[PDB]
Amino acid sequence: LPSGIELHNRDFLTDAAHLPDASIDLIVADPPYGLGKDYGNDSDKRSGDDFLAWTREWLELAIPKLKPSGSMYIFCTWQYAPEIFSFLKTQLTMVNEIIWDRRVPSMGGTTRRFTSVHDNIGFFAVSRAYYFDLDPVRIPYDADTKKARSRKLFEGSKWLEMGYNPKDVWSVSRLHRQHAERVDHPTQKPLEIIERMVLASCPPGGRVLDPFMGSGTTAVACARQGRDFVGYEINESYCAIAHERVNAL
Amino acid sequence: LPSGIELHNRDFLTDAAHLPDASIDLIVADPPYGLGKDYGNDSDKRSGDDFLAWTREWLELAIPKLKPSGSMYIFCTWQYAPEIFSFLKTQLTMVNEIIWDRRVPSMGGTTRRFTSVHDNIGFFAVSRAYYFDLDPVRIPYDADTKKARSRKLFEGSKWLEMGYNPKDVWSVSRLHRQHAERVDHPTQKPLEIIERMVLASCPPGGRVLDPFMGSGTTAVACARQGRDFVGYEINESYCAIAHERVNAL
DNA sequence: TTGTAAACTAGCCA
DNA sequence: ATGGCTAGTTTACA
DNA sequence: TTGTAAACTAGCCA
DNA sequence: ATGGCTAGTTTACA
Ligand SMILES: Nc1ncnc2c1ncn2[C@@H]1O[C@H](C[C@@H](N)CC[C@H](N)C(=O)O)[C@@H](O)[C@H]1O
Ligand SMILES: Nc1ncnc2c1ncn2[C@@H]1O[C@H](C[C@@H](N)CC[C@H](N)C(=O)O)[C@@H](O)[C@H]1O
User: Fold this and answer.
1) Rounded to whole angstroms, how far apart are CA atoms A112 and B33?
2) Start and end of every DNA methylase N-4/N-6 domain (chains A, B) (predicted)?
3) For the residues of A64-77, what is the DSSP string, one character each?
């Protein structure tokens, strides 16, 4: 693996003390949602107050590892987002709530509620002096859309010439099983949304921590974009896929 | 004023006793977000624990008006949604977190966070037997998309033939000032999303309560779909606009 | 054009 | 306090 | 084709 | 403690 890519097949809650405090620039956290998925383990088989008690345990181990300029993105479901975000507001300050629109809805067969098509991403910061660089994540227009948005009043603006803010709603399809990026992990996140978080909230060459890296999407996003990565995954098969993914760029 | 459609220029919190308990099928609440808007009053000038205390007060008066099959939609901002939704889960059951993608982002000039393009709507129910009808709110395909979505496995299914679930993310654009639906209210909500709430969670002939009706968007929806309405608005100017919007049907 | 899986069925009845 | 019936659920990748 | 407003700037300094 | 000044922010209505 490259220099700052550290892939650890260890339980994060047992091996976090090994990680030095105030040593991480960004935490990309995609922990189990509490939704009953199979990760080769029972991490997602926890529910209710037991899941919320576990979430706080790992968070109180990860927050100290954050530099005074560090930030943190946390994925969760709406079923536990209000409580998770309420706790993290007493430990950090919330900069954004990012809604990942997965375009493809969750299946099941219900007709008594609207279908799940969104995950909740909480953007928190340690202090008001958090590192945020928008320019590498600006989305530039194409020729046609730039012509449709340009006015004499807007001419010369950075949103029109360089690119606009991704906003707090990111419409990106989930990865199909046959998608080129897809690997053998049940909850693989698109590289597009993870790379955006690293390029905007981790200073170039800084260290990013994925307490639960799964298949190493945050590692790939840190290999390219030149950022340092520390990742923990209990599953060995997942840790393997992670290496292969970082050993193919 | 049509029958069943009831408009009041009063404070909801003081006139709550006038509303019989367990008499309302659906509460469509668009309360002040706590963002500093000017409705001719200072109701949106409350903040922090002052706003959440007032939110929990009106919610404690509005909840016992829901009959056992009742439901409630409440708009808010991500800055207070975790706290608001955490309190309501202690009183009611959360069925859904609907994200309104307003398509058009909020303005200001920031480059230190992602821009706001979404409001949070909470779908809470009093009990597990809440009324919910999806057929009136199913979105039928057009000739081109149904051709792209149709497979022999899906042929005959309600979603492909009748229409799909609108999902928990609603991409409806905010109303431009020059839009023909736009009236002189600072935060008018599109009738498309209010009618969806009324058609899915209120039976025809049922009663809808809007404690902060504003320009009367819910009054217009209840009138056009055969639902009874009760609304409150401290601003007489907005109350007037609410009258014209209903009487123009 | 088409097969097919993707973080988030549920209400009855027994 | 608990299963197992049912009708039932979208999009976009290859 | 073009003007224009829409629930959610932010740090600095005289 | 307080404006004011700055560089700065998108779509889709008409
Ligand atoms: N204590 C733990 N330490 C490290 N990893 C864990 C722990 N508990 C669960 N995990 C793993 O955390 C992962 C959570 C996943 N949602 C990560 C997905 C990852 N972002 C991906 O794109 O593949 C699962 O694969 C679990 O096996
Ligand atoms: N105690 C109160 N009682 C009744 N109305 C109030 C109260 N406080 C604030 N309001 C009004 O509630 C409204 C909140 C608005 N978001 C309503 C918008 C409304 N949904 C519309 O589509 O026009 C404002 O117009 C307030 O003037």
Assistant:
1) 28
2) 24-243
3) GGEEEEEEEEEEE-
In this structure, are residues A11 and A53 in contact, taking their beta carbons and an 8 Å threshold? no
Residue A195: CB atoms within 10 A of its CB come to 20
Degrees (nearest 5) of the Cα angle A42, A44, A45?
A: 60
Q: Test A82 with B82 for CB contact under 8 angstroms.
A: yes
Is A167 in the B-facing interface, judged by CB distances under 8 Å? yes
Indicate which of B49, B110, B114 best probes the interface with A, i.e. most A CBs within 10 Å of its own CB: B114
Per DSSP (E only), the strands in chain A are: 5-8, 24-29, 66-76, 93-101, 118-125, 169-171, 207-210, 228-232
Asked whether the beta carbons of B130 and B160 are under 8 A apart, the reply is no
State whether the beta carbon of A22 lies below 7 angstroms from any atom of strand C.
no
Token pair for residue A142?
A: 């194409």
Report which residue is nearest nucleotide E2 when distances run from CA to C1'. A151
Query: What is the rounded distance in angstroms from the CA atom of residue B104 to the CA atom of residue B174?
Result: 6
DSSP labels for B14-83?
TSGGGSPTT-EEEEEE----SS---SSSSGGG--HHHHHHHHHHHHHHHGGGEEEEEEEEEEE-TTTHHH
| Phi, psi dihedral angles at B40 (to 5 degrees) | 75, -5
Residue A242's φ and ψ, nearest 5 degrees, are: -60, -50
Resolution of the entry in angstroms: 2.4
Report the amino acid identity of residue B8: H
Please report, for chain B, the start and end positions of each structural domain, with discontinuous segments joined by +.
Answer: 5-136+167-247
Q: Is any atom of strand C within 7 angstroms of residue A120's beta carbon?
A: yes
| B79:A94 CB<8 A | yes
CA–CA dist A214, A101 (Å, integer): 21
Ligand 2 close to Cβ of residue B123 (< 6 A): no
Q: Which two tokens stand for residue A197?
A: 């978080």
- The answer to whether residues B170 and B157 touch, using CB atoms and an 8 Å cutoff, is no
Q: How far, in Å, CA of A159 to CA of A182, rounded? A: 32
Helix (H/G/I), strand (E/B), else coil: B98: strand
Q: Is A120 an interface residue toward B (CB < 8 Å)?
A: yes
The β-bridge partners of B122 are B74, B97
Residue A193 near residue A100, CB atoms below 8 Å: yes
CATH architecture of A5-138+166-246: 3-Layer(aba) Sandwich (3.40)
Among residues A190, A188, A144, A149, which one has the least CA distance to residue A171? A190
End-to-end CA distance of chain A: 10
CB contact under 8 A, B99 and A99: yes
Task: Read off the tokens for A164.
Answer: 């606009």
| Architecture of the domain spanning B5-136+167-247 | 3-Layer(aba) Sandwich (3.40)
CB of B230 within 8 A of CB of B208?
yes
